[PDB]
Amino acid sequence: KGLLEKYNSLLEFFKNKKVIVAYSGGVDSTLISKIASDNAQTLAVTIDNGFFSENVIKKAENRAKKYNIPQKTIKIDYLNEITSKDLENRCYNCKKRIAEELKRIKNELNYDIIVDGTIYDDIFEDRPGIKAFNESNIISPLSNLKFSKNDVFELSNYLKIDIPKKDTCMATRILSAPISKENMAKSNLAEEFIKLNFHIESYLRVRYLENIAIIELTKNESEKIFDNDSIERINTELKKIGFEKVVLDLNFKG
Amino acid sequence: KGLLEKYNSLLEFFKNKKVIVAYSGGVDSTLISKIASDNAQTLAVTIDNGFFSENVIKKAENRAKKYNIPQKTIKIDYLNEITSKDLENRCYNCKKRIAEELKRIKNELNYDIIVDGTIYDDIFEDRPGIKAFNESNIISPLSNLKFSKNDVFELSNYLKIDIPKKDTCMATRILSAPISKENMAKSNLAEEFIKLNFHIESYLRVRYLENIAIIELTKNESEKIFDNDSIERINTELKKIGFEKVVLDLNFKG
Numbered sequence: 001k002g003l004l005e006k007y008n009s010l011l012e013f014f015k016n017k018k019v020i021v022a023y024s025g026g027v028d029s030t031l032i033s034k035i036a037s038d039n040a041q042t043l044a045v046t047i048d049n050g051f052f053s054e055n056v057i058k059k060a061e062n063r064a065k066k067y068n069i070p071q072k073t074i075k076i077d078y079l080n081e082i083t084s085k086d087l088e089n090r091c092y093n094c095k096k097r098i099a100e101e102l103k104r105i106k107n108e109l110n111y112d113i114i115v116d117g118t119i120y121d122d123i124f125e126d127r128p129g130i131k132a133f134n135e136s137n138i139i140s141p142l143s144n145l146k147f148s149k150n151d152v153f154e155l156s157n158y159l160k161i162d163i164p165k166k167d168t169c170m171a172t173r174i175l176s177a178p179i180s181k182e183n184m185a186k187s188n189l190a191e192e193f194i195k196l197n198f199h200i201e202s203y204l205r206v207r208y209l210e211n212i213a214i215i216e217l218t219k220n221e222s223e224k225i226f227d228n229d230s231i232e233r234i235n236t237e238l239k240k241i242g243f244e245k246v247v248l249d250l251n252f253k254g
Numbered sequence: 255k256g257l258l259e260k261y262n263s264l265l266e267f268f269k270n271k272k273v274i275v276a277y278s279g280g281v282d283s284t285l286i287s288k289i290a291s292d293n294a295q296t297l298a299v300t301i302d303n304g305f306f307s308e309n310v311i312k313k314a315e316n317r318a319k320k321y322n323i324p325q326k327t328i329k330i331d332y333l334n335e336i337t338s339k340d341l342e343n344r345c346y347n348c349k350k351r352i353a354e355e356l357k358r359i360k361n362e363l364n365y366d367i368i369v370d371g372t373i374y375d376d377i378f379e380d381r382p383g384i385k386a387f388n389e390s391n392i393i394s395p396l397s398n399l400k401f402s403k404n405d406v407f408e409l410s411n412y413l414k415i416d417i418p419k420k421d422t423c424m425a426t427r428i429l430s431a432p433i434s435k436e437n438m439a440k441s442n443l444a445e446e447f448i449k450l451n452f453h454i455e456s457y458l459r460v461r462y463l464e465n466i467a468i469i470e471l472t473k474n475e476s477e478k479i480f481d482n483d484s485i486e487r488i489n490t491e492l493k494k495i496g497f498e499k500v501v502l503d504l505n506f507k508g
């Protein structure tokens with residue numbers, strides 16, 4: 001209870017430690033990395049699973065390079081054959097392979113600890129990504145110091161850290177096994193097309209379900225795609241990408 | 255070439271024969287039955303597979319009773335366990351079981367032939383329903399006499415036969431095995447709800463795909479369901495019926 005008390009609790013923890021930070025680019029994973037660079041010999045490690053586009057990785061690298069946070073990105077052949085046909089435990093298996101790599105880096109570098117940007121608010125949601133993680137003894141310092149979503153934003157503003165657009169995992173679009181590089185690309189192009197041609201600035205999802213495109217969208221964005229000329233253009237272009245059927249989820253986001 | 259030449263060709267064929275007609279209620283299957291009643295000892299047989307609602311069977315019975323066509327309806331336990339998990343050859347298996355029954359009735363009644371309302375235009379479309387049928391030696395007299403769609407309508411008007419609404423098979427809505435009585439009911443209620451509350455008079459389909467409702471509709475009917483209040487009401491009521499997800503096929507009918 002008190003941001004300076006948390007800010008100074010955090011600095012005391014980082015003092016004289018060799019810290020490897022699970023750096024992704026996101027507000028939370030960025031803030032933990034910046035504070036660590038200023039107070040400890042710190043390396044921001046980004047594991048490229050094949051779930052985030054080149055642009056998202058470039059953005060993460062360009063943020064660390066901008067805020068003088070030492071960062072190394074590791075491309076991994078994670079999408080294999082056993083790993084590709086997972087679907088239900090993939091958020092655990094993906095985060096288990098990441099933790100496996102960070103643990104290797106720490107041991108090769110003879111570093112002391114591995115930290116992640118898990119905030120306090122993140123513990124009140126079903127997150128199998130931090131189930132697999134906290135199995136491998138990864139310390140979540142923000143959660144331990146009760147950092148809320150607005151605490152992370154406020155401290156970020158003070159530390160001159162820009163708030164980036166929320167680039168989310170693209171394996172989430174895959175609703176039917178397997179999670180293929182092409183299956184994700186099909187969703188990515190469909191999203192990019194609808195967002196650019198029809199200007200869906202807010203929430204947009206093109207889910208893959210056995211080659212069926214399920215379009216999810218916000219309530220106030222709805223009007224932008226209701227003319228039959230837009231519906232025909234979307235149905236036509238999405239089938240050209242590779243889809244069998246183009247459907248729209250009538251459950252619009254609140 | 256010439257309707258009276260076809261009308262009189264047909265009467266010559268029916269003379270002195272005991273005819274069992276595959277009667278369904280539809281314009282084509284009705285016209286063949288009426289002409290047969292007037293010129294031969296004829297029985298219009300309707301096989302209730304469990305694919306057409308009580309109302310559709312009642313309509314078929316009330317048409318035959320109105321046009322003094324002798325008709326007997328046979329309820330069959332067709333939806334079983336081996337027959338229920340078919341999907342791709344179900345239009346062949348359904349029409350194979352029907353032909354199996356009509357052949358039994360003909361042999362028990364010691365009747366001469368079995369005819370069906372397959373018109374000439376019906377031979378230029380992939381119909382596995384008349385593949386299974388013409389295997390069991392069922393004569394399609396309308397097709398043999400080159401009767402087109404408009405020839406059937408014109409002769410029907412002359413014979414004072416009313417043209418009914420096109421009640422279609424409800425196993426067609428089932429896109430994922432098995433074709434269950436409940437699975438079809440889920441589609442039927444969804445169609446009845448949208449057609450009554452939102453007035454979709456023309457083409458409307460609520461397909462079942464592993465508990466996912468796929469709404470198919472006409473191009474000019476589209477406008478009737480574009481307000482977010484209608485979309486919310488449809489998504490809500492359809493999930494109450496039993497669906498997991500309510501989606502709309504963006505391929506509107508021409």
Ligand code: SF4
Binds near residue numbers: 090092129169170172
């Ligand atoms: S959300 Fe995506 S990146 Fe995160 S654990 Fe799940 S699969 Fe991996």
Ligand code: SF4
Binds near residue numbers: 345383
């Ligand atoms: S359309 Fe329906 S009633 Fe006709 S053969 Fe196919 S399953 Fe049977």
Ligand SMILES: [Cl-]
Binds near residue numbers: 129169
């Ligand atoms: Cl994530």
Ligand SMILES: [Cl-]
Binds near residue numbers: 383423
């Ligand atoms: Cl049929």
